[PDB]
Amino acid sequence: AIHNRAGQPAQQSDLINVAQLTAQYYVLKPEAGNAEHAVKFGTSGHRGSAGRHSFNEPHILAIAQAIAEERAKNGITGPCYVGKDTHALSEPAFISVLEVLAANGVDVIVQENNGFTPTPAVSNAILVHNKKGGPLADGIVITPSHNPPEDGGIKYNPPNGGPADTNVTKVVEDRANALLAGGLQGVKRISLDAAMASGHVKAVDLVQPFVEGLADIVDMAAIQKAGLTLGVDPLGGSGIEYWKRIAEHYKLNLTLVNDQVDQTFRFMHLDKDGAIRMDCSSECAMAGLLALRDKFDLAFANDPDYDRHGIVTPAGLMNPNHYLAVAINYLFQHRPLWGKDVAVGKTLVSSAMIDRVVNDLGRKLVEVPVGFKWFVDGLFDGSFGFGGEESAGASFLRFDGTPWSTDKDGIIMCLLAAEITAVTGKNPQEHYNELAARFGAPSYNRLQASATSAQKAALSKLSPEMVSASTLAGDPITARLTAAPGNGASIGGLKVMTDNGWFAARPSGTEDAYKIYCESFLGEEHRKQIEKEAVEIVSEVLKNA
C-alpha cells in the first residue's frame, strides 16, 4: 500500500478515453526504427498500448499472419478458438485476428454475441476438441491479463492447450517483425464482413460446455448441499457470465457483488501504486470485496483473463502461497482416482509449506523454475495432479486424472475453495491455520537491489560449487541449487536450502537488478538472518563480475 489513494475508488481523472484509444489502434503506427514499438511476443504473448504505438493494427495483423503460417507449418488443420477479455483494445485486436485468420483459410470458433472468454475456457475447449482424435484445434487469447485499461495483449495456445513455448513464440515474433519491416506486404486479409460470410468463422456458446464440465473436476454436489453463502467480485472480467451461469446451473447461493463491465474499469479501487489494475490477489484492488467479507462464508475474484484467483474469507484476502499449500493438502486426500504416481508441481520460489504438505502425504514433489510453462506437459499427460505459482495461478486434473485446462484456471481454483469449505466444514484460511499449527507459521519476504549489467549476467551463470557456504542462519545447508530438482531445468540463479529455511536469488527480467526470495519456518528474526546471509552470498559470488 504505497500510494496515498491506494485502495480508494477510482475517480474520473483516473480514467481513459476508450473511443480515443481505440481510434489510436487504427490511426497510429509503430515508428520505423523504434525498438520500443516492435512486437515482443513471449510467454504471455505481446502486450502494449495503442497510445504508445505498441498495440496497433499493424502489430495484430502481423502477429495473426505469423500464427496462421506457423500453425499450418506445424500441421494444425482443425479450428482456432479465439477468445477475448474485456479490455478495450481486445475489440479491435479480435477483428484483426478474424480478418487475417479467415484470409489464411483458418477455421475460427468464437463466443457468440461478441461475448468474453477466459483463458482456461480456451484451454479447456482446445483439450476437449483434441480428445476427439481428429484435426487438431489450437487457440488465441486476446488479453493482457490484469494490466491497466489502456493495454492490450494477445497470446497463442497450441494443441496441448497450454501457453505456447519459445520454439513457437520466437518464430512468431521474428516473423511478425519481418512483416512490419516489410510494410505488411505478406499479410493476407479479408474484410470483417467477408470473414463472417466466408464460412470460416463459427460462433458458439463456449460457456455452457465449460460450466457443465465443472462437475467433472470440482465436487459441485457437495458445494450445493453445504448451502454456503458465496460472494464473487467478477472485477469486470472475461468470466463474469461464467459466474452467473455457474450460480444458475448449480443452484448456488452465489452473489455477484457488482456486475459492471466497463472498458474504463472505473468501478475499481486503485491498486497499491494508484493505478487501475484488476489484480485479484492485491488487497488494494480487492478493497471493494473485502469491505463485504463479513457477508460471505467465502468470496473470490479473478483477473480479467480468469486464469488467476483471489480467495476471501471473513478473515481477509488469503495469501496466494497459503492457499496453494491448502489446495494441495486437500486435493491429494480427496481425489482417490488419481494414481499413486500423480505428482505435485511447485515453482522454486513458492512456500516450503508445500514441501511439508507433500512429504506428509507421501506424494512426489516436482520443483520447477518459475513460469507455468513447466507444468503444461505434466498436466497434459496426467503426471502432475496440480501445478501452481505463488503469483495466484494454478490448475489441477479432472477427478479421473485427465486434464481440464493446461493453462492456469482461476475458476476451478475458486470453486475448489468452496469444495474445501463444504466437504470439510472449514474454510481454506482455517485449514492454513491448522497447517501453521502443525509445521510452524513460515515468514516469507522478497528483496530487490540493483546490479550492473555484467553482475546480472553473472548471476544466471553460477554453479553450485561457486557457493562455499555450509550453513545458513545457523542450520546446515541441505542443498545449493542452480537447477530445479524436479525437472533439472536451469534456475538462471541460485537457491540455498536448510531444513528450516531457504533463499533463492534470480536476476530481474526487466531491470538491471536481482531479487531474493526467502522464507523461514522459525519466524521473522530467523528470516532476517537468512536475508542478511543471502545478500552476503550473492555479493561474494558476483564480486568479480
The correct pick among 151, 303, 367, 533 for binding Mg ion (CB under 5 A) is 303
Largest Cα separation within the chain, whole Å, is: 71
Residue 17 site contact among a second copy, Mg ion, none (CB < 5 to 8 Å, cut-off depends on kind): a second copy
Residues 134-153 that bind a second copy (CB under 8 A): none
b/e string for 165-204 if b means 16 or more Cβ within 10 A?
A: eeebbebbbebbbebbeeeeeebbbbeeeebeebebbeee
Residues 177-206 that bind a second copy (CB under 8 A): 191-193
- According to the binding rule CB under 8 A, does residue 259 interact with a second copy? yes
| Minimum distance, C-beta of residue 17 to a second copy, in the bound complex (Å) | 7
- According to the binding rule CB under 5 A, does residue 305 interact with Mg ion? yes
| Triad 19, 24, 27: Cα angle to 5° | 125
Residue 19 site contact among a second copy, Mg ion, none (CB < 5 to 8 Å, cut-off depends on kind): a second copy
- According to the binding rule CB under 8 A, does residue 424 interact with a second copy? no
Phi/psi region, residue 471 (left: phi>0; alpha: psi -120 to 50; beta: rest), is: beta
Question: Please, where are the H alpha helices in 38-118?
Answer: 57-73, 90-103
Q: How far apart are CA 354 and CA 339, in angstroms?
A: 20
Residue 279 site contact among Mg ion, a second copy, none (CB < 5 to 8 Å, cut-off depends on kind): none
Q: How far apart are CA 381 and CA 195, in angstroms?
A: 36
| Minimum distance, C-beta of residue 93 to a second copy, in the bound complex (Å) | 9
The correct pick among 89, 100, 232, 541 for binding a second copy (CB under 8 A) is 89
Considering 145, 350, 395, 443, which one is annotated as catalytic? 145
- Known catalytic membership, residue 281: no
Q: In this structure, are residues 168 and 156 in contact, taking their beta carbons and an 8 Å threshold?
A: yes
Q: In this structure, are residues 468 and 480 in contact, taking their beta carbons and an 8 Å threshold?
A: no
Q: Are strands 80-84 and 138-142 parallel, antiparallel or unpaired?
A: parallel
SS3 category, 296? coil
State the DSSP string of 220-259.
HHHHHHHT--EEEE-TT-TTHHHHHHHHHHTT--EEES--
- According to the binding rule CB under 8 A, does residue 25 interact with a second copy? yes
Identify which of residues 26 and 183 has a Cβ nearer to a second copy in the complex.
26
The correct pick among 222, 261, 466, 469 for binding a second copy (CB under 8 A) is 261
Q: Which residue is nearest to Mg ion (CB)?
A: 145
Whether residue 279 is annotated as binding a ligand: the answer is no
| Minimum distance, C-beta of residue 209 to a second copy, in the bound complex (Å) | 23
Which residues would be at the binding site for a second copy (CB under 8 A)? 12, 15, 17-23, 25-29, 88-92, 95, 99, 114, 191-193, 259-264, 266
Annotated binding-site residues for Mg(2+) read 145, 303, 305, 307
Which residues would be at the binding site for Mg ion (CB under 5 A)? 145, 303, 305, 307-308
Which amino acids are annotated catalytic?
Answer: 145
